[PDB]
Design a protein around this ligand. Sequence first.
Ligand SMILES: COc1cc(N2CCN(C)CC2)ccc1Nc1nccc(-c2cn(C)c3cnccc23)n1
Ligand SMILES: COc1cc(N2CCN(C)CC2)ccc1Nc1nccc(-c2cn(C)c3cnccc23)n1
Ligand SMILES: COc1cc(N2CCN(C)CC2)ccc1Nc1nccc(-c2cn(C)c3cnccc23)n1
Ligand SMILES: COc1cc(N2CCN(C)CC2)ccc1Nc1nccc(-c2cn(C)c3cnccc23)n1
Lengths: 337, 333, 344, 341
Amino acid sequence: KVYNDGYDDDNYDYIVKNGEKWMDRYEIDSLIGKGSFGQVVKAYDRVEQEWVAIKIIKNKKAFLNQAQIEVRLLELMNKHDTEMKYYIVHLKRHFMFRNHLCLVFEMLSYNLYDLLRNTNFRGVSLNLTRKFAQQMCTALLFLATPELSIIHCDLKPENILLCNPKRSAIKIVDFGSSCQLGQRIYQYIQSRFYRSPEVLLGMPYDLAIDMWSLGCILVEMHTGEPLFSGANEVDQMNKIVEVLGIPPAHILDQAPKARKFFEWNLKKTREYKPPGTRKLHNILGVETGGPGGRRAGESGHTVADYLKFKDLILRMLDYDPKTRIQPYYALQHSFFK
Amino acid sequence: KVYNDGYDDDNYDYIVKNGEKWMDRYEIDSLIGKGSFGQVVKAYDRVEQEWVAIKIIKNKKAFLNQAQIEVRLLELMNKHDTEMKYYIVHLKRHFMFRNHLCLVFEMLSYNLYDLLRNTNFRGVSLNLTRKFAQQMCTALLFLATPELSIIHCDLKPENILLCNPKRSAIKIVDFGSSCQLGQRIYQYIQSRFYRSPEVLLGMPYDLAIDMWSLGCILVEMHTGEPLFSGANEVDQMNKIVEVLGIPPAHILDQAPKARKFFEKLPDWNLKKEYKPPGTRKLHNILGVETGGPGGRHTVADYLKFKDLILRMLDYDPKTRIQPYYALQHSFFK
Amino acid sequence: KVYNDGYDDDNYDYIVKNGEKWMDRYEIDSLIGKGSFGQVVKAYDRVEQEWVAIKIIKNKKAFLNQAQIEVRLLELMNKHDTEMKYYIVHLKRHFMFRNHLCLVFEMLSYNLYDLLRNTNFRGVSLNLTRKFAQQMCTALLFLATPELSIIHCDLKPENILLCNPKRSAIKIVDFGSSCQLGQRIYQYIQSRFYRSPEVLLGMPYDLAIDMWSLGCILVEMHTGEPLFSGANEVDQMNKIVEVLGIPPAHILDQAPKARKFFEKLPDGTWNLKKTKREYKPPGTRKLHNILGVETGGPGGRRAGESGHTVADYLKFKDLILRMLDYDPKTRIQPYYALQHSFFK
Amino acid sequence: KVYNDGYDDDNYDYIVKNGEKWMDRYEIDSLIGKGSFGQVVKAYDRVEQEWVAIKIIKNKKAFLNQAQIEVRLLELMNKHDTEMKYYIVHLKRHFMFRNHLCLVFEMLSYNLYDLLRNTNFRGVSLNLTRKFAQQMCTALLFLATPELSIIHCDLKPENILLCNPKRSAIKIVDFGSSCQLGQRIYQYIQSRFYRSPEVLLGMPYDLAIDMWSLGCILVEMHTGEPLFSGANEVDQMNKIVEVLGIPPAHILDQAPKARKFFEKLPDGTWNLKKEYKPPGTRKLHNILGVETGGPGGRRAGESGHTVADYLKFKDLILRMLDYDPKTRIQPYYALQHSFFK
Ligand SMILES: COc1cc(N2CCN(C)CC2)ccc1Nc1nccc(-c2cn(C)c3cnccc23)n1
Ligand SMILES: COc1cc(N2CCN(C)CC2)ccc1Nc1nccc(-c2cn(C)c3cnccc23)n1
Ligand SMILES: COc1cc(N2CCN(C)CC2)ccc1Nc1nccc(-c2cn(C)c3cnccc23)n1
Ligand SMILES: COc1cc(N2CCN(C)CC2)ccc1Nc1nccc(-c2cn(C)c3cnccc23)n1
C-alpha cells in the first residue's frame, strides 16, 4: 500500500513534486528525465544560487550499487588535472535524501536528441558536426587515459549534452552503464542503434566500442536520422551490412554469434538492400549537396569537406576493433585541420 | 516494439513460456514467483533427472551485478565443509541463457508464508515452532562464520522454504539482498514487519538484525500473525514499543533518527491509539499462562519460549542473543 | 648490482640522501623511521612552507598494494568534517616518485615509546595519562564512525605520536595494518603485548580489539612498563590471566585456540595448562595493586602529588577494567568511555 | 627476541625444518627456493601418496595479500575445463598453517636458468627451443582467454620450469606479480632483461608485454646468454636500440618517458640522447648465426638448423620483438608460424 513512508511509488522511484525543497536546499523545478536508474530533476540550489541537475536513484539495492560505481568513476576522473576532463559533465556532490542516493551535477541545456528534434531530424551543419566530433574524440581520449580506461558503453545522442544553446560546447553524461577495461562480463551492452559489431557477434570488446558509437552518432547529427535503425539484433546487423557490406572473414571466423547472422554470406530473415549498396557516400550526399541536397553551396560543405568527413566516419566504423581509429589518431585527422 | 530480439518484455524480464525447453536440458514447467530481481521458475533438468528452481535475472546491468554478488556469496558457502550449510538453499550452478543470468537451485516445496496460509493464519504448534527455530538458529550460526559474516537482510516467512510437506526441514532462500559485514552502505533494509530497531533508528548494524527478524518470525509462526505489522516506519516502531517499552536511553542518545519516533525530556518518551509502552506483553501474546495463542506444550515450555524470543528481541544489538548461545537455550533441550 | 637505476638498495628501499630536493618541492632532511613498508623521512615542503613526514613505500608490488589500502582509509577519513578527525595523523597528499609511492603526513614530534624512555620507564603522571586517555578515546570514537568502522589493529606506544614537544596533544599514526570491519581476513594481528584475548584465542573480532590495546597502553603510560609483557603467545595469555583471571567458559567453549592455553577438565571447567614459567594464581595480580591505588601510585612515586588521590586512582582503575573486559561485546565502547567519571 | 612463537625468523619467513610433518599430512623435505614472497619447499603428501611443492608465503600482511591475488588468478585458471591450462604449474590447494598462507603446487624438477647453466651458457638446440616455444605460446594463448586476460608480468628463465629431464614439458610458474587486463596500476614491472619497450617508455600495456619477454627468452635459450643485459633502464633501452634501431616516432611522440632515452630534433625526428654500437647495427642475424652454423658455429650441419630453419626463427623472434604492442605477434598467430611447421 505505502512505500518508503509514502515517498516512493511501487517502482522504488521517489514521487517527484514540484516546489519541494530537498534537504531544505534544492528547490525542485521539473523533471529532466526518467530511466531504469531513477529520475533526473531540474532544481535550484538555494545555497549556491544556481541551477543543478539532480539524479535521484531508485530506492533499491541493485540501483544504489550501480549508482555507487558511477560516483566512484566520476570522482576518479575528477582527480585528473587535464583540461580534457571538462568534456565530462561534472559531479558537484552527492547525498542521501529519504533513502535515495542523489547525484548533483552541473546543469546543461539539453541533449543532442533534443538538438536533432530542433532540426526536425534533418541534421545540423557539417561545421557544427566537426566541432562536436572534435570534442567527443577529446572526451574519448580522456576516458582512454590508462589509469582510467573507462568504457562509457551507452553513447547515444541522449547521453551527450549541449552546454548553452548559443554555443557548440558539449559534454558526455551518465556513466551508470560504464565500466573500466578490467570489469567486463556483460556482453549485451550499448544501445542497439549504436551497438558495435563485436558486441553483436560476442567478441572481446574494449574502449573501441565507444568509437563505433561515435561514428554512428556523428552521421546522425549531420543527416538528422539514425545511421543503423535496427529493430532487433539481426535487423541491426542487416542495416549495418547494407552500408558496410559483409564483415571480414577473419572476424566472422572467430565470431561466436556469426551464424546468428551469416552463413561468408548473409543469412535471410521487406527485403534488405544488398551488401554495401547503401553507400555512405550517398547517405552523406558527398557530391549531391549533403543530406537531402539541403547543404548545396553552404560554406564548409564542399566536396573536399565531405570526403574528409566520410573518411573519418569510415575509420570509426571499421569492422575490426583492433584497427578501428583510436582517439589520439582521430584528433589528428584532416577533417579537423 | 520488441526487446532482446523478442525474448524479453518491456521490463526486460524473460517472457516465461511454460513447456519451453532450454538447451535440450531444462523443461520449464511453471512460474514459482516474481520479484524485483526477475523470475523464479520450476523446471526439470533432463540431464541430471532432477527438479530445480531457476532464478532468471532481469536483462539489465544493475540486476546482473547484484545477482553476481549473490552468486559469489553462495559459492563462498559451498566451500565450507560443515553440515550447517545445508540449511541454506543450495545453488547447483549458474549459466547465461539468452542474455539472462540464471541461478539453478535445489527445488523445495513451498515457503513458510504458504504454510501460514495453510493453517488459515492460526499458526503451527510450539513443537513445530521449536524445530523451525533450531534449524534457523543453526543457519544463522553458519552465516556468522567469521570468514562469511553474511547478513541475509530480508529474513521473513516468504524467504524460508519447506523441504517436504510431510517433514519439518527448512532452508533459507534468496541472498539477493544479502551482504557481508562491512562499513555501512545501505540503511533502508529488511522487510518492514521484520525490520530491526537499529535499522529504524539509523544506527550501526550487523548480523544481529537477522536474529531480530527471526524472533518476529518465530512468534508469527506460532500465532499465525505478524508480531509488528507496521503500516509505515513510525507505525512500526510504535508497534514494537507496544510490546517492548521505550528503547533504552543510551540507545536513543546515539540514535540519529531517535526524534523521528521519540522526544528527549529535560530529565525519553514517545512522540505522537497505541497501547501504552510495554503493556502489549509477549506473555499474553503467546498465551503463556492461558494454554497458548487463543486457547490451544507446558507453561514451563511457553516460559522457555518467551525467554528465548525476548533475548532475540533485545533492543541492544550488542547484547541480543547470538546464534551459538541461542542453540544452548533451554527451549531446545 | 644496480636497483631502480641506482636509486634503490637491494631491498628496493629508496636510498635516502640528506639534502636531496624532490620535484623542486620537498627538501629531504633526515630519516624519521624505518619499517618493512619502507621508510619515513623528515622533509621541508617549500610550497606549503612547513615540515612534513614523507612515508616512502618500498618499490615492490606487495608493499605498494598495501600502502594503497592505507591511502584509501586515510582519504575515506579525510571526507569526514568532524573535529574528532584531528586525533589521526593527517594525510596531506600522495604521489609517485622514482617508482615509490610517497605519503605526505603532517610532521609530529616523537612517539609515546620515546616518552616512556624519557621517564626511564617510570611513567608519566595520572594527569597527563588522563589527557592521553580522553584523546585516544575520541580517536577510537572517530574510527567507529559507521561509514568508517576502521580497526587500527596495531595500537601501541610507537604508533601514538606527540604533536608538539610542549603540548599534550597526541594522535594515532600508521594505518598500514588497518582494516575496515568485515569478514575476517587476518588472524595474526596486533603487537603481542597489546594483543586482545579474542585474537589470541582465534575468535571473531571487531573494533573492540583497539580498546583492549588502549587499556594496556594507558596502564603502561602511567607505570612506565607494559602491563602484559608476553615473551610468546602462551606467556602473553598467562600474564593476562594473572591479572584478570580465567576467561569465561562460554568464550573458551568457542575459541578455536583455547587448547593452546587451557585444559577442559572432567568437571567441565577450564584451567590453564602447565608451562612446558611461574605465574601467580589466576586473578591474584590485581590491577588495584599494579596501579598502587592506595599506596602512592606506581612504586609509590606519586604519593602526595596533586591529582593522584585514592579517589582519582579508583576512577582510573574502573575505566581500565572496562577496557579489559574479556567479552568484546560488553567491553566499553569509546562513546561511553568518554562519559566515564575519570574524565568528569 | 622471538617471532611468531619462534616459528619465524626476523624476515617473517617460516623457519623450515627438514622432516617436519604438518597437520599429520604434509611431510616437509627440503627448501626448493626463496624469493621476496617467502619460500618454496618440496614435501610429501602422505594422505594422497604424492610429492608436492609448497609455496610458504611470508607471515606479513602485504605478502599475504599479494598471494591471495595469486590464489584468485590460479583458481580462475582451474575453472577452465581445457587442455591448455596444463602449461601452467597447477595449483592443487591452499591452506593456512602457523600464520602462513601455503600454496600446494604440483612439483617440477628445475628451471630454465638451470638448463642454461647445464649447457655452460651455450644454449640448447633449435629443435628443443622450438618445442619449448610452442608450449610457451600455448600457455600465452590460454592466458589470453577472454574471461582470463591474464598478464603474467614476470616471464623469465627462473619462472619457466622443466617438468623432468627426459620429458620435453615446460610450464610457467609464479603468478604473484600477475594481473588481469585492466586500468593501469603499476608501471615498474617485468624483470629488467625481459622488460618490454612500452613499459620502459611508460605507455599503456596489455598481454603483449609477455610476448616481448618470450622473444627475449627464446633467443637466450638458443644462445645461452641474455639478449638484452641492461645494467639499468637506460642501458636496457640502449641495448634494445643496438639490435632493433630507434623506435617508431609515433610511439615516441606519445611516450611519457621518451626523453629519458631519446632527444627530439628540431626537424621533428628522434635520436638517442648523450658508448654503444650505432642503432640497428647489432644484427640478430649475427647473434643467431643464421649463416655460420648457429651460435658459436656449433650447430653447423645439425638436423633442424638449416639456413631456412634459422630464417624462420629470426622472423618469428623479430615478430615477437615488434616495438609496437598493437602489431606484435599474438599467441594464436605465433602458433601458425612456419617455424613450427
Ligand atoms: C534543463 O536541463 C536538461 C534538459 C533536458 N531535456 C531532455 C528532455 N527534453 C524533452 C527537454 C530537455 C535534458 C538534460 C538537461 N540537463 C542536464 N544537465 C546535467 C545532467 C543531466 C542528466 C540527464 N540525464 C539523462 C542524466 C543521467 N545521469 C546523470 C545526469 C543526467 N541533464
Ligand atoms: C514449487 O516450489 C516452490 C513453490 C513456491 N510457491 C510460492 C508461492 N505460493 C503461492 C505457491 C508456492 C515457492 C518456492 C518454491 N520452490 C523453491 N525452491 C527453491 C528456490 C526457490 C526460490 C523462490 N524464490 C522467491 C527464490 C529467490 N531466489 C532464489 C531461489 C528462490 N523456491
Ligand atoms: C621527527 O619526527 C618524528 C620522530 C620520531 N622518532 C622516533 C624514534 N625516536 C628515537 C626519535 C623520535 C618518530 C616520529 C616522528 N614524526 C612523525 N610525524 C608524522 C608521521 C610519522 C611517522 C612515523 N612512522 C613510523 C610512520 C608510519 N606511517 C606513517 C607515518 C609515520 N612520524
Ligand atoms: C626441486 O624442484 C625445483 C628445484 C628448483 N631449483 C632451482 C635452483 N636450482 C639451482 C636447482 C633447482 C627450482 C624449482 C623446482 N620446483 C618447482 N616445482 C613446483 C613449483 C616450483 C616453484 C618455484 N618458484 C620460484 C615458485 C613460485 N611460485 C610458485 C611455485 C614455485 N618449483
